[PDB]
Amino acid sequence: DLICAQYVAGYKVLPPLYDPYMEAAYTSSLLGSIAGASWTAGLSSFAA
């Protein structure tokens, strides 16, 4: 499933800003920020 109509009709699909490695790093950051992560009143301490 390619898009060959690009090169005939005259439009271009632009690639996204990040590659799959960086998106995987973002969701691993989200997964590792779940336990602990400012256990208390403010947001300044980080309890493991």
Partner 1 sequence: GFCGTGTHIVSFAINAPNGLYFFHVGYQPTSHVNATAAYGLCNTENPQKCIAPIDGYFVLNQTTSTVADSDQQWYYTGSSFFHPEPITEANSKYVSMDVKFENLTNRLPPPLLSNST
Partner 2 sequence: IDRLINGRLTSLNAFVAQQLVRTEAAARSAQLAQDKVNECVKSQSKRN
Residue 4 in contact with partner 2, rule: CB under 8 A: no
User: Is the CB of 14 or the CB of 40 nearer to partner 1?
Assistant: 40
Pick one of 30, 41, 47, 48: the residue that binds partner 2 (CB under 8 A).
Answer: 30
Q: What is the SS3 assignment for the chain?
A: CCCCHHHHHCCCCCCCCCCHHHHHHHHHHHHHCCCCCCCCCCCCCCCC
The residue within the footprint of partner 2, chosen from 4, 34, 41, 47 (CB under 8 A), is 34
Cβ contact 28:34 at 8 Å? no
Residues that bind partner 2 (CB under 8 A): 30, 33-34, 37
